[PDB]
């Protein structure tokens, strides 16, 4: 029995930037008041986890990364009321406390208890539940899913349907929800519109799914890797373009293709240049552009404000704009009811011990989502 | 009868940047097909007219400036159907052709026939109706209202109520409608919200009027000239702040005052740095910031896209988002029914011949709107 005791288990520790993950034994403390200890079942490999290795995303090291996952509750601390031992759950990298001004607003989701704006790499109480070779290890976004067991605050976990398939619905913990919501909730794509989607990875394919569900008439995928085009068309793209095939900047190409600019554009890569290109390709009087990709730390973009004065709208969002704890269970129920598909995003399935091979697949351009199974 | 004949009259010609206007005789050709010749009655002095003098707003010289005005139709060219000789009219610096994709869109107002994106300083047919000292003189934004007589395209004029007081309703041709619509139509300010307005000139005061009409609970005026505060409070500001009084950046001050950021902010000055400050002071998850001020020609701002990724919305607009020809007559009817006030914007009255004194008053900080009478 493990309840109330320290657990010794395997985890993927990142000791320093620009090194492979180290798969080794860690110690996981029992949950304190208002905390939940979870046995992980499946976790996806997202580009944001890779950003921690490359130095694009800054968060305290050493760390247990991972934020897109699903598992089963092993034990609960004093005072927990929304999950119980044995429940299927998805960790929430954006929390939902329900009591701050953002949680109370009709359209906000970036809860003020988040560990994203100024990352500390701890539990809500400022301490860590992990140790490795006698050294305390940091948490990541309040989730830390690259471990057989994790501990999360109650505001950072949602209970889901007991019959759901965890090796698929882990994607609702990040990539699917982010891209789909960016289209249907943040941009509010309209029927008959023309959309442009920059970046055709797991998140950009989810944006395409949302634009198709909203009734867009045209969905133009943009990527420098033409091997991404076939799957983009399968999930709804009507046409695909590679900027390196053209002797003119792609914003000009897209403006001409759309007879004067697109209705909705999405940056789903993480580059300053493509954020400005995506804004510029939407129609100057009524276009909308949404930033989803995460750019290198502490770098500013340059742009001419006349792009906005004519009438464009520019926005960004975390997690597709969804209030996390309310939305995650509903998205799983919609999946169970066949309202959307997750299989098109999954290209590879590997045991957790093959995490480094899964990161090599992402970096080489060969995969969309690899799902790691514990 | 002057119909079909060249009219010799006085106009304010700008021959060179950074010099006074020259009040001298010009020749005004009769209107061609789908053109309207107007006897001007009153015109306002707007900061955008000053931007032509300072080289902030680039348009070809020599030029007859002026864009905020009202007058009476002298004659109509062949095929005109929307106005007749003797009608009271307001020239429209943003046209409304009714036939392009923008005019047909529910939100759009930046008609594709505009002379703003890349000013050419002509009529729609690419020619000029003005000569001075024997040379052709450019038009400005299709309006050129600093002249006893001007010629405009039919898509750039609206018929208004025959009983309208032209010395007041000329402000509906730019400053009032721009500020009011930026609040009520572009931002869509909500009841009980907190707003911040940067710049307390004629346009910023009109933004305040709109925020108060929309039911905002708090309206914070921001200006480096404290002499602008008394009038801002008269029209609805609840508090006013001068950035020069504070040791901390004003975005930090405003975030503290609003217990975490404002609901709606407006840049109504024309500086790159205040555009970035205004964005930053709105709440990071659900705030909205609207750019109204005109930026220095061809200059780019620098900003961190993490301001948008958390959830902020950034937009701009011309003429308050209003479809010009549909909206101007309705705004005049609302003024006649006392739905809004224009007298608070009018601080000085001068004859047209004293135009240079009117620009001196604006540049010294002493005026809001000076109205010139022909
Ligand atoms: N806002 C959020 O809440 C949120 C959550 C999900 C992920 N993220 C971010 O979303 C982005 C996408 O994540 P993903 O997992 O889909 O990544 P990914 O690496 O699988 O996909 C990115 C795609 O961009 C393409 N690309 C790279 N450089 C390009 C360039 N110069 N021009 C055109 N295409 C280019 C690649 O070929 C690739 O197919 C990442 O930056 C990630 O950090 C954000
Ligand atoms: N978008 C549009 O359609 C549109 C139409 C109307 C006018 N314009 C622009 O709107 C702006 C305002 O026009 P206006 O006629 O009200 O001008 P104005 O000059 O009367 O008002 C601007 C105000 O900004 C204040 N100011 C200047 N620098 C400042 C700083 N660093 N910080 C804080 N306050 C500062 C001044 O003291 C002044 O009271 C101008 O840039 C004009 O060109 C845009």
């Amino acid at each position: 029995s493990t309840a109330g005791k320290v657990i010794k288990c395997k985890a993927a520790v990142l000791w320093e930037e620009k090194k492979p993950f180290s798969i080794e034994e860690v110690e996981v403390a029992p949950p304190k008041a208002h905390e939940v200890r979870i046995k992980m079942v499946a976790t996806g490999i997202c580009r944001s986890d890779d950003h921690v290795v490359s130095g694009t995303l800054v968060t305290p090291l050493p760390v247990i990364a991972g934020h897109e996952a699903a598992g089963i509750v092993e034990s609960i601390g004093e005072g927990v009321t929304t999950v119980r031992p044995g429940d299927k759950v998805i960790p929430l990298f954006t929390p939902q406390c329900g009591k701050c001004r953002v949680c109370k607003h009709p359209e906000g989701n970036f809860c003020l208890k988040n560990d994203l704006s100024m990352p500390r790499g701890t539990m809500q109480d400022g301490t860590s539940r992990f140790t490795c070779r006698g050294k305390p290890i940091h948490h990541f976004l309040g989730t830390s899913t690259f471990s057989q067991y994790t501990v999360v605050d109650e505001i950072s976990v949602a209970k889901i349907d007991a019959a759901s398939p965890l090796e698929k619905v882990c994607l609702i913990g990040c990539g699917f929800s982010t891209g789909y919501g960016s289209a249907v909730k943040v941009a509010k794509v309209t029927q008959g519109s023309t959309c442009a989607v920059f970046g055709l990875g797991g998140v950009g394919l989810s944006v395409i799914m949302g634009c198709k569900a909203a009734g867009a008439a045209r969905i133009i995928g943009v990527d420098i890797n033409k091997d991404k085009f076939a799957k983009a068309k399968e999930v709804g793209a009507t046409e695909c373009v590679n900027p390196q095939d053209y002797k003119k900047p792609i914003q000009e190409v897209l403006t001409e293709m759309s007879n004067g600019g697109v209705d909705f554009s999405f940056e789903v890569i993480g580059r300053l240049d493509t954020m400005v290109t995506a804004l510029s390709c939407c129609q100057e009087a009524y276009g909308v552009s949404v930033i989803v990709g995460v750019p290198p730390d502490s770098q500013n973009l340059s742009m001419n404000p006349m792009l906005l004065l004519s009438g464009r709208t520019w926005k960004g969002a975390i997690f597709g704009g969804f209030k996390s704890k309310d939305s995650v269970p509903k998205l799983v129920a919609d999946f169970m009811a066949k309202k959307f598909a997750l299989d098109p995003l999954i290209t590879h399935v590997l045991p957790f011990e093959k995490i480094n091979e899964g990161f090599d697949l992402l970096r080489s351009g060969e995969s969309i989502r690899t799902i790691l199974t514990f």
Side-chain angles (χ1 to χ4, degrees), chain A residues 243-322:
Chain A
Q244 300 174 352
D245 285 346
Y246 290 85
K247 291 180 190 174
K248 290 158 155 25
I250 205 73
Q251 67 193 217
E252 297 179 18
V253 175
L254 292 164
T255 297
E256 280 170 11
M257 290 171 68
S258 63
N259 298 294
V262 303
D263 298 287
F264 302 95
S265 66
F266 303 84
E267 199 283 4
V268 207
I269 304 161
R271 299 178 57 89
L272 301 176
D273 67 277
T274 47
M275 292 171 189
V276 180
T277 288
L279 174 66
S280 303
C281 85
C282 77
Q283 202 288 326
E284 67 182 350
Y286 57 71
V288 176
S289 188
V290 179
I291 307 180
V292 186
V294 172
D297 184 75
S298 299
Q299 304 308 292
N300 280 197
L301 61 75
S302 171
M303 61 82 72
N304 187 321
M306 289 18 107
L307 292 173
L308 300 171
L309 275 157
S310 54
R312 294 185 179 81
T313 301
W314 207 9
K315 69 200 304 186
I318 303 302
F319 197 59
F322 287 119

XYZ file of all heavy atoms in Angstrom, chain A residues 243-322:
603
model
N 6.378 28.440 -47.772
C 7.048 29.709 -48.051
C 8.348 29.594 -48.831
O 8.687 30.497 -49.623
C 7.285 30.363 -46.668
C 6.194 29.723 -45.843
C 6.030 28.297 -46.348
N 9.107 28.513 -48.650
C 10.384 28.387 -49.379
C 10.211 28.010 -50.846
O 11.226 27.899 -51.567
C 11.320 27.433 -48.638
C 11.683 27.854 -47.217
C 12.495 26.799 -46.492
O 12.675 25.681 -46.996
N 12.900 27.097 -45.260
N 8.981 27.841 -51.335
C 8.720 27.637 -52.766
C 8.530 28.947 -53.525
O 8.422 28.942 -54.772
C 7.464 26.765 -52.959
C 7.672 25.288 -52.674
O 8.830 24.828 -52.576
O 6.632 24.579 -52.552
N 8.435 30.091 -52.843
C 8.043 31.368 -53.423
C 9.172 32.400 -53.386
O 9.935 32.457 -52.419
C 6.870 32.069 -52.693
C 5.575 31.311 -52.924
C 5.262 30.245 -52.105
C 4.702 31.656 -53.938
C 4.093 29.512 -52.294
C 3.523 30.940 -54.120
C 3.221 29.864 -53.313
O 2.051 29.156 -53.491
N 9.227 33.219 -54.439
C 10.199 34.299 -54.540
C 9.688 35.621 -53.976
O 10.365 36.658 -54.110
C 10.398 34.922 -55.813
C 11.080 33.883 -56.690
C 11.365 34.383 -58.103
C 11.810 33.215 -58.972
N 11.997 33.548 -60.415
N 8.543 35.688 -53.315
C 7.924 36.833 -52.655
C 7.567 36.392 -51.221
O 7.224 35.216 -51.049
C 6.568 37.267 -53.267
C 6.529 37.893 -54.621
C 5.100 37.692 -55.153
C 4.740 38.741 -56.180
N 5.966 39.289 -56.834
N 7.599 37.261 -50.231
C 7.177 36.945 -48.866
C 5.762 36.365 -48.868
O 4.867 36.756 -49.631
C 7.301 38.243 -48.057
C 8.229 39.075 -48.912
C 8.048 38.655 -50.367
N 5.506 35.397 -47.999
C 4.237 34.639 -47.969
C 3.035 35.491 -47.596
O 1.920 35.179 -48.031
C 4.348 33.323 -47.166
C 3.321 32.267 -47.603
C 4.233 33.588 -45.680
C 3.541 31.582 -48.926
N 3.180 36.601 -46.836
C 2.006 37.451 -46.572
C 1.420 37.991 -47.875
O 0.183 38.144 -48.002
C 2.315 38.578 -45.569
C 3.282 39.646 -46.052
C 3.824 40.571 -44.987
O 4.020 41.791 -45.204
N 4.027 40.065 -43.797
N 2.279 38.350 -48.850
C 1.804 38.835 -50.151
C 1.089 37.735 -50.931
O 0.026 37.931 -51.525
C 2.992 39.421 -50.958
C 3.587 40.625 -50.264
C 4.774 41.311 -50.918
O 4.995 41.087 -52.115
O 5.448 42.097 -50.201
N 1.662 36.531 -50.933
C 1.052 35.366 -51.573
C -0.342 35.066 -51.022
O -1.324 34.864 -51.765
C 1.986 34.141 -51.404
C 1.323 32.889 -51.950
C 3.353 34.385 -52.035
N -0.462 35.043 -49.680
C -1.753 34.761 -49.054
C -2.799 35.844 -49.283
O -3.991 35.533 -49.436
C -1.538 34.504 -47.537
C -0.767 33.218 -47.214
C -0.270 33.280 -45.770
C -1.620 31.967 -47.428
N -2.379 37.105 -49.333
C -3.291 38.223 -49.626
C -3.834 38.051 -51.046
O -5.045 38.203 -51.277
C -2.577 39.564 -49.414
O -2.203 39.681 -48.016
C -3.444 40.761 -49.776
N -2.964 37.702 -52.007
C -3.455 37.520 -53.387
C -4.357 36.303 -53.497
O -5.432 36.343 -54.147
C -1.986 36.962 -54.281
C -1.434 38.130 -54.446
C 0.151 37.482 -55.065
O 0.375 36.166 -55.424
O 0.863 38.656 -55.741
N -4.044 35.191 -52.833
C -4.855 33.991 -52.890
C -6.282 34.186 -52.375
O -7.254 33.566 -52.837
C -4.232 32.829 -52.083
C -2.983 32.234 -52.674
S -2.163 31.057 -51.568
C -3.385 29.739 -51.567
N -6.420 35.034 -51.341
C -7.672 35.364 -50.678
C -8.368 36.609 -51.201
O -9.313 37.125 -50.603
C -7.403 35.464 -49.160
O -6.498 36.523 -48.877
N -7.926 37.106 -52.359
C -8.535 38.270 -52.998
C -8.611 39.443 -52.029
O -9.619 40.166 -52.003
C -9.887 37.858 -53.614
C -9.716 36.777 -54.705
O -9.121 37.048 -55.741
N -10.240 35.600 -54.457
N -7.511 39.721 -51.324
C -7.368 40.882 -50.466
C -7.125 40.642 -48.987
O -7.121 41.623 -48.223
N -6.848 39.420 -48.549
C -6.570 39.087 -47.150
C -7.573 38.073 -46.583
O -8.728 38.009 -47.010
N -7.088 37.269 -45.618
C -7.937 36.226 -45.025
C -8.809 36.773 -43.888
O -8.524 37.828 -43.280
C -7.089 35.019 -44.532
C -6.237 34.429 -45.669
C -6.221 35.346 -43.317
N -9.893 36.068 -43.565
C -10.747 36.457 -42.446
C -10.073 36.200 -41.083
O -10.202 37.001 -40.135
C -12.092 35.715 -42.493
C -12.885 36.045 -43.746
O -13.408 37.189 -43.808
O -12.988 35.197 -44.654
N -9.414 35.044 -40.945
C -8.822 34.595 -39.696
C -7.436 33.965 -39.946
O -7.335 33.085 -40.834
C -9.692 33.531 -38.980
C -11.098 34.020 -38.671
C -12.158 33.758 -39.546
C -11.358 34.776 -37.522
C -13.421 34.284 -39.313
C -12.631 35.269 -37.282
C -13.664 35.030 -38.165
N -6.402 34.377 -39.214
C -5.096 33.704 -39.303
C -4.657 33.310 -37.899
O -5.062 33.873 -36.891
C -4.031 34.562 -39.976
O -3.756 35.700 -39.155
N -3.770 32.277 -37.862
C -3.305 31.660 -36.633
C -1.786 31.421 -36.722
O -1.321 30.767 -37.670
C -4.008 30.304 -36.363
C -5.504 30.412 -36.298
C -6.301 30.399 -37.448
C -6.135 30.555 -35.056
C -7.675 30.555 -37.373
C -7.520 30.702 -34.979
C -8.289 30.696 -36.146
N -1.030 31.894 -35.727
C 0.426 31.585 -35.657
C 0.555 30.428 -34.664
O 0.195 30.564 -33.482
C 1.284 32.782 -35.276
C 2.764 32.631 -35.631
C 3.643 31.763 -34.747
O 3.163 31.127 -33.785
O 4.895 31.749 -35.005
N 1.000 29.243 -35.166
C 1.057 28.015 -34.370
C 2.436 27.364 -34.480
O 2.603 26.138 -34.630
C -0.095 27.024 -34.723
C -0.404 26.159 -33.499
C -1.361 27.737 -35.183
N 3.489 28.225 -34.422
C 4.897 27.836 -34.579
C 5.705 28.276 -33.361
O 6.283 27.447 -32.635
C 5.536 28.440 -35.865
C 4.746 28.056 -37.142
C 7.003 27.975 -35.969
C 5.053 28.966 -38.323
N 5.787 29.595 -33.137
C 6.637 30.181 -32.102
C 7.781 31.002 -32.642
O 8.925 30.927 -32.130
N 7.569 31.814 -33.683
C 8.608 32.676 -34.236
C 8.070 34.113 -34.335
O 6.941 34.337 -34.765
C 9.074 32.222 -35.606
C 9.704 30.860 -35.751
C 10.066 30.527 -37.199
N 10.965 31.522 -37.756
C 12.286 31.489 -37.692
N 12.946 30.497 -37.109
N 12.975 32.485 -38.231
N 8.920 35.096 -33.993
C 8.491 36.502 -34.084
C 8.143 36.884 -35.520
O 7.110 37.555 -35.742
C 9.603 37.397 -33.529
C 10.021 37.155 -32.086
C 11.213 38.054 -31.710
C 8.867 37.346 -31.111
N 8.912 36.429 -36.522
C 8.664 36.812 -37.903
C 7.306 36.308 -38.415
O 6.552 37.023 -39.109
C 9.823 36.462 -38.855
C 10.033 34.971 -39.049
O 10.717 34.365 -38.186
O 9.527 34.423 -40.046
N 6.967 35.059 -38.069
C 5.685 34.483 -38.515
C 4.516 35.091 -37.750
O 3.388 35.124 -38.293
C 5.729 32.951 -38.493
O 6.285 32.453 -37.275
C 6.541 32.396 -39.658
N 4.709 35.596 -36.517
C 3.610 36.322 -35.849
C 3.251 37.582 -36.643
O 2.057 37.903 -36.841
C 4.019 36.656 -34.402
C 4.128 35.405 -33.542
S 4.841 35.721 -31.905
C 5.030 33.993 -31.354
N 4.250 38.343 -37.094
C 3.990 39.574 -37.878
C 3.443 39.243 -39.267
O 2.483 39.896 -39.718
C 5.235 40.472 -37.907
C 4.950 41.747 -38.723
C 5.689 40.859 -36.497
N 3.960 38.214 -39.935
C 3.435 37.739 -41.223
C 1.965 37.319 -41.098
O 1.123 37.656 -41.946
C 4.309 36.541 -41.729
O 5.580 37.103 -42.135
C 3.695 35.786 -42.896
N 1.639 36.544 -40.042
C 0.258 36.101 -39.863
C -0.684 37.275 -39.652
O -1.814 37.281 -40.172
C 0.147 35.073 -38.729
N -0.266 38.289 -38.874
C -1.124 39.476 -38.707
C -1.342 40.153 -40.069
O -2.463 40.528 -40.440
C -0.499 40.459 -37.703
C -1.237 41.803 -37.546
C -2.638 41.599 -36.921
C -0.412 42.758 -36.706
N -0.239 40.354 -40.807
C -0.303 41.090 -42.073
C -1.164 40.432 -43.132
O -1.787 41.144 -43.936
C 1.129 41.266 -42.628
O 1.983 41.935 -41.705
N -1.259 39.097 -43.158
C -2.047 38.382 -44.171
C -3.547 38.394 -43.946
O -4.311 37.999 -44.873
C -1.523 36.950 -44.377
S -2.156 35.715 -43.213
N -4.006 38.837 -42.749
C -5.470 38.955 -42.561
C -5.923 40.308 -43.144
O -5.159 41.272 -43.219
C -5.904 38.662 -41.115
S -5.657 39.921 -39.815
N -7.199 40.341 -43.564
C -7.754 41.519 -44.259
C -7.621 42.752 -43.376
O -7.929 42.736 -42.174
C -9.186 41.213 -44.714
C -9.691 42.072 -45.867
C -9.982 43.497 -45.481
O -10.423 43.780 -44.361
N -9.770 44.452 -46.412
N -7.159 43.880 -43.964
C -6.745 45.032 -43.159
C -7.866 45.736 -42.390
O -7.536 46.437 -41.388
C -5.986 46.059 -44.034
C -6.887 46.705 -45.082
C -6.203 47.682 -46.005
O -5.033 48.053 -45.766
O -6.875 48.096 -46.990
N -9.113 45.656 -42.821
C -10.235 46.332 -42.187
C -11.004 45.487 -41.157
O -11.576 46.079 -40.218
C -11.236 46.762 -43.282
N -11.054 44.148 -41.322
C -11.908 43.305 -40.480
C -11.264 41.960 -40.143
O -11.903 41.142 -39.451
C -13.316 43.118 -41.095
C -13.308 42.527 -42.490
C -12.961 41.191 -42.707
C -13.628 43.283 -43.607
C -12.946 40.637 -43.982
C -13.653 42.736 -44.882
C -13.319 41.412 -45.069
O -13.321 40.901 -46.368
N -10.009 41.741 -40.518
C -9.325 40.470 -40.224
C -9.010 40.324 -38.729
O -8.876 41.307 -37.992
N -8.857 39.063 -38.310
C -8.492 38.680 -36.938
C -7.295 37.716 -37.018
O -7.351 36.741 -37.779
C -9.683 37.999 -36.211
C -9.287 37.501 -34.826
C -10.871 38.959 -36.097
N -6.273 37.947 -36.205
C -5.101 37.070 -36.107
C -4.887 36.653 -34.637
O -4.900 37.524 -33.741
C -3.835 37.705 -36.657
O -2.745 36.787 -36.735
N -4.686 35.349 -34.405
C -4.505 34.778 -33.074
C -3.101 34.169 -32.968
O -2.703 33.289 -33.766
C -5.573 33.703 -32.758
C -5.333 33.120 -31.367
C -6.984 34.270 -32.899
N -2.318 34.608 -31.954
C -1.030 34.026 -31.610
C -1.233 32.861 -30.627
O -1.818 33.019 -29.536
C -0.047 35.040 -30.974
C 0.123 36.300 -31.824
C 1.289 34.358 -30.698
C 1.074 37.338 -31.248
N -0.745 31.675 -31.039
C -0.753 30.462 -30.225
C 0.685 30.017 -29.903
O 0.959 29.515 -28.803
C -1.536 29.309 -30.914
C -1.670 28.103 -29.985
C -2.939 29.737 -31.385
N 1.611 30.134 -30.872
C 2.980 29.670 -30.634
C 3.735 30.449 -29.551
O 3.477 31.620 -29.318
N 4.693 29.748 -28.916
C 5.541 30.333 -27.855
C 6.962 30.581 -28.425
O 7.666 29.768 -28.850
C 5.682 29.296 -26.694
C 6.694 29.729 -25.638
C 4.322 29.004 -26.038
N 7.266 31.946 -28.262
C 8.554 32.427 -28.805
C 9.725 32.417 -27.846
O 9.460 32.351 -26.639
C 8.283 33.901 -29.184
C 7.437 34.318 -28.002
C 6.512 33.166 -27.704
N 10.946 32.555 -28.343
C 12.103 32.579 -27.471
C 11.980 33.629 -26.375
O 11.585 34.797 -26.579
C 13.329 32.765 -28.386
C 12.831 32.236 -29.707
C 11.342 32.607 -29.746
N 12.401 33.224 -25.173
C 12.365 34.065 -23.998
C 13.011 35.441 -24.169
O 14.096 35.595 -24.721
C 13.189 33.382 -22.868
C 13.094 34.165 -21.585
O 12.041 34.107 -20.919
O 14.039 34.903 -21.190
N 12.318 36.467 -23.677
C 12.806 37.848 -23.645
C 13.092 38.532 -24.957
O 13.818 39.543 -24.998
C 14.051 37.941 -22.738
O 13.721 37.556 -21.413
N 12.521 38.076 -26.074
C 12.715 38.685 -27.375
C 11.477 39.459 -27.812
O 10.356 38.954 -27.763
C 13.044 37.637 -28.449
C 14.245 36.736 -28.178
C 15.494 37.504 -27.838
O 16.032 38.192 -28.708
N 15.951 37.397 -26.598
N 11.654 40.675 -28.308
C 10.561 41.524 -28.785
C 10.443 41.462 -30.302
O 11.444 41.371 -31.023
C 10.783 42.985 -28.405
C 10.439 43.408 -27.002
O 10.292 44.608 -26.698
N 10.173 42.501 -26.095
N 9.207 41.556 -30.803
C 8.928 41.667 -32.239
C 8.884 43.156 -32.612
O 8.748 44.045 -31.733
C 7.654 40.929 -32.689
C 6.295 41.315 -32.125
C 5.741 42.615 -32.709
C 5.286 40.175 -32.322
N 9.006 43.440 -33.906
C 8.894 44.800 -34.445
C 7.722 44.831 -35.418
O 7.637 43.943 -36.284
C 10.205 45.065 -35.230
O 10.135 46.272 -35.970
N 6.832 45.834 -35.355
C 5.708 45.915 -36.293
C 5.242 47.356 -36.490
O 5.469 48.186 -35.592
C 4.539 45.007 -35.876
C 3.897 45.289 -34.522
S 2.671 46.639 -34.515
C 1.319 45.853 -35.398
N 4.581 47.629 -37.611
C 4.038 48.951 -37.901
C 2.609 49.017 -37.393
O 1.746 48.247 -37.841
C 4.079 49.155 -39.445
C 3.702 50.568 -39.856
O 2.814 51.198 -39.297
N 4.352 51.124 -40.887
N 2.266 49.931 -36.471
C 0.899 50.001 -35.913
C -0.174 50.381 -36.896
O -1.381 50.198 -36.605
C 1.001 50.974 -34.717
C 2.237 51.766 -35.029
C 3.189 50.866 -35.809
N 0.180 50.853 -38.117
C -0.834 51.046 -39.163
C -1.534 49.738 -39.529
O -2.692 49.741 -39.983
C -0.200 51.690 -40.422
C 0.215 53.143 -40.286
S 0.372 53.707 -38.597
C 2.136 53.843 -38.375
N -0.891 48.568 -39.271
C -1.574 47.290 -39.486
C -2.844 47.148 -38.627
O -3.809 46.506 -39.039
C -0.625 46.104 -39.196
C 0.557 45.892 -40.139
C 1.496 44.809 -39.624
C 0.092 45.528 -41.556
N -2.805 47.738 -37.412
C -3.959 47.712 -36.505
C -4.912 48.895 -36.737
O -6.148 48.729 -36.669
C -3.506 47.703 -35.031
C -2.639 46.502 -34.626
C -2.059 46.666 -33.235
C -3.442 45.208 -34.733
N -4.372 50.102 -37.009
C -5.226 51.278 -37.201
C -6.275 51.116 -38.286
O -7.386 51.663 -38.157
C -4.366 52.529 -37.497
C -3.871 53.199 -36.214
C -2.618 54.021 -36.502
C -4.911 54.093 -35.548
N -5.967 50.391 -39.366
C -6.962 50.143 -40.428
C -8.177 49.318 -39.994
O -9.230 49.364 -40.656
C -6.276 49.515 -41.645
O -5.542 48.339 -41.272
N -8.024 48.530 -38.908
C -9.145 47.757 -38.390
C -8.847 46.340 -37.956
O -9.745 45.697 -37.377
N -7.630 45.812 -38.141
C -7.304 44.450 -37.703
C -7.436 44.314 -36.189
O -7.241 45.251 -35.414
C -5.898 44.052 -38.126
C -5.625 43.912 -39.637
C -4.225 43.395 -39.903
N -3.874 43.209 -41.315
C -3.488 44.183 -42.141
N -3.454 45.444 -41.755
N -3.143 43.868 -43.397
N -7.711 43.073 -35.762
C -7.727 42.627 -34.376
C -6.613 41.595 -34.175
O -6.526 40.625 -34.961
C -9.079 41.982 -34.012
O -10.140 42.943 -34.227
C -9.155 41.525 -32.561
N -5.789 41.743 -33.138
C -4.683 40.850 -32.812
C -4.895 40.348 -31.376
O -5.057 41.156 -30.450
C -3.345 41.586 -32.891
C -2.112 40.793 -33.199
C -2.016 39.475 -33.588
C -0.762 41.285 -33.254
N -0.710 39.123 -33.845
C 0.085 40.243 -33.666
C -0.209 42.543 -32.956
C 1.448 40.429 -33.827
C 1.152 42.734 -33.109
C 1.973 41.671 -33.533
N -4.899 39.043 -31.176
C -5.089 38.495 -29.821
C -4.184 37.291 -29.646
O -3.668 36.740 -30.642
C -6.529 38.425 -29.410
C -7.126 37.333 -30.313
C -8.638 37.416 -30.430
C -9.374 37.377 -29.112
N -10.855 37.311 -29.287
N -4.004 36.851 -28.403
C -3.379 35.552 -28.150
C -4.183 34.816 -27.063
O -5.124 35.396 -26.486
N -3.808 33.573 -26.766
C -4.470 32.856 -25.684
C -3.621 31.660 -25.248
O -2.827 31.105 -26.034
C -5.852 32.324 -26.107
N -3.846 31.276 -23.989
C -3.340 30.020 -23.427
C -4.464 28.994 -23.396
O -5.635 29.311 -23.062
C -2.810 30.265 -21.985
C -1.716 31.338 -21.927
C -2.327 28.965 -21.349
C -0.511 31.040 -22.774
N -4.171 27.738 -23.775
C -5.115 26.617 -23.657
C -6.437 26.884 -24.379
O -7.526 26.494 -23.914
C -5.338 26.218 -22.172
C -5.964 24.862 -21.952
C -5.360 23.702 -22.437
C -7.141 24.705 -21.223
C -5.931 22.452 -22.238
C -7.707 23.451 -21.018
C -7.098 22.313 -21.531
N -6.348 27.535 -25.567
C -7.561 27.726 -26.387
C -8.615 28.610 -25.784
O -9.767 28.617 -26.260
N -8.275 29.414 -24.751
C -9.254 30.226 -24.056
C -10.174 29.455 -23.110
O -11.027 30.071 -22.439
N -10.040 28.131 -22.974
C -10.955 27.357 -22.120
C -10.679 27.490 -20.626
O -9.531 27.344 -20.169
C -10.826 25.862 -22.490
C -11.424 25.414 -23.790
C -10.644 24.848 -24.806
C -12.789 25.535 -24.007
C -11.221 24.387 -25.987
C -13.378 25.089 -25.170
C -12.593 24.521 -26.164
